[PDB]
């Protein structure tokens, strides 16, 4: 006669709960899968790529259980501009007797260390191998900077293909090539529709998907039949994530940095402002451990235009108040994931798509803002995303001086003008400020068929610096 909530409570108590992180742990010995780290933070960022109207948030929800908002009335149904997120934990059964394929089970972040095994007949307990964060990416042809920024964030890929539709989906190929651009090679192919399609169509679609990916950079990509609503073949997904995808080399030997993609103003309506919260910027830490209590500044920050037309860049110093990750406020931040940094940054600064694609650095470093950048660029032979009805997919043209091109340096979305075009090198003038940290793998897109279309890749080799104003 025990209520379900008290049952979940005794499960949480028996599972060990969620222990608080130590205030100052020895950071030399902390590996990304330590109990102090992995029980309360995701360490690998997995992103879903696919064509529109195929279902990516639903798949992650079936994996994890955390919903991806889907806000803004009009965007409740069609497409979402900003990235959708969900927390997932990979729990593996410790009992060897139960079959390996169903040992894996993906749970919400609200779960404990050692939850009971839900298979009928198994008293054993699960072990949390790793927490994984899910950076969902828009899969539409208009929103192109967002998916490139998400790819700059994410570390593992899940490609989504429909079964009953046409095999050579161009949006998926564009996404796959975009991931190929930035030194990311772990992609898992996931067939969304398996219930509504036949047995021989299954082999036909398998063969088509195999034939598509033969000459691209990724060669050994696994394929898995999944279903977003039937809630099946989820354990094998976690198995593939565990086995195929390792942790890229990332430690604390590197200087701290941040890359903010989403802005969040914490201003609860109706309640008195005497009890208010700060401004939260959603940023990935690709390098450097962060802790409660720091001085940090965004480099481009305030972008003002004077009476003479010159652009003045005021970096925005801010004292971080908290580092929200997973479910609980943490004391140390584990790099290699999106954490919500809540700081004293003015709430209006975090309201709209203002902190979208912007680099941030802790005090003790000086990232450099650039206004004219020298890039080295390489192109593909054909455009990706165009549906020519049976004729020679649009061939890529060579660049022209004084044209606007969307030059996505990591997460930044910049419309640059071209100054000089060489065979491999070019110079870009940016009215929207951009910053340089080390190399910053860049993506390039242009405009022919209205909406932006990817063309190739670029890497910064030089630039013209603008000193931040104190």
């Amino acid at each position: 006669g025990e209520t379900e909530e008290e049952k979940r409570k005794r499960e949480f108590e028996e599972g060990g709960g969620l222990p608080e992180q130590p205030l100052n742990p020895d950071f030399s010995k902390l590996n990304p899968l330590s109990a102090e780290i992995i029980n309360r933070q995701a360490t690998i960022n997995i992103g879903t790529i696919g064509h529109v109207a195929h279902g990516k948030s639903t798949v992650v929800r079936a994996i994890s259980g955390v919903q991806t908002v889907r806000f803004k009335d009009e965007l409740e149904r069609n497409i979402t501009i900003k990235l959708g997120y969900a927390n997932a934990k990979i729990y593996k059964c410790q009992e060897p007797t139960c079959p390996e394929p169903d040992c894996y089970r993906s749970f919400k972040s609200d779960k404990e260390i050692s939850p009971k095994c839900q298979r009928p007949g198994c008293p054993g307990r699960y072990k949390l191998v790793r927490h994984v964060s899910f950076v969902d990416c828009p899969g539409h042809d208009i929103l192109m900077s967002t998916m490139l920024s998400g790819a700059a964030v994410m570390d593992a890929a899940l490609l989504l293909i429909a079964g009953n539709e046409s095999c050579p989906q161009p949006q998926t190929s564009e996404h796959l090539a975009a991931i190929e651009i930035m030194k990311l090679k772990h992609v898992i192919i996931l067939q969304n529709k398996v219930d509504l399609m036949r047995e021989e169509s299954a082999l036909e679609h398998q063969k088509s998907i195999l034939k598509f990916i033969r000459g691209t950079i990724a060669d050994g990509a696994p394929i898995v039949p999944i279903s977003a609503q039937l809630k099946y073949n989820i354990d094998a997904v976690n198995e593939f994530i565990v086995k195929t995808i390792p942790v890229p080399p990332r430690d604390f030997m590197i200087s701290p940095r941040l890359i903010v993609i989403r802005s969040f103003d914490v201003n609860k309506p109706g309640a008195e402002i005497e009890d208010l919260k700060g401004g939260v910027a959603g940023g990935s830490i690709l390098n450097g451990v962060f802790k409660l209590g720091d001085e940090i500044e965004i480099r481009p920050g305030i972008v003002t235009k004077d009476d003479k037309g010159k652009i003045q860049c005021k970096p925005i110093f801010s004292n971080i108040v908290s580092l929200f990750a997973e479910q609980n406020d943490l004391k140390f931040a584990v790099p290699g994931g999106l954490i919500g940094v809540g700081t004293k940054v003015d709430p209006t600064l975090c309201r709209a798509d203002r902190l979208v694609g912007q680099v941030v650095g802790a005090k003790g470093h000086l990232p450099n803002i650039y206004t004219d950048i020298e890039i080295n660029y390489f192109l593909l032979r054909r455009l990706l995303g165009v549906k020519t009805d049976g004729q020679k997919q649009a061939k890529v043209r060579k660049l022209e001086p004084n044209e606007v091109l969307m030059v996505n340096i990591g997460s930044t979305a910049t419309g640059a003008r071209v100054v000089a075009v060489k065979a491999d090198m070019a110079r870009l003038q940016l009215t929207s400020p951009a910053c340089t940290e080390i190399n910053e793998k860049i993506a390039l897109s242009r405009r022919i068929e209205k909406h932006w279309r990817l063309i190739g890749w670029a890497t910064i080799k030089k630039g013209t610096t603008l000193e931040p104003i104190a």
Partner: peptide, 23 residues
């Protein structure tokens, strides 16, 4: 190697046949 892909497909079809014999 897509050999470990047809197996999950077989499992999915078998689950469908057991759960939904009408289809």
């Amino acid at each position: 190697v897509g050999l470990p892909y047809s197996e999950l497909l077989s499992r999915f079809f078998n689950i469908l046949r057991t759960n939904n014999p009408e289809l």
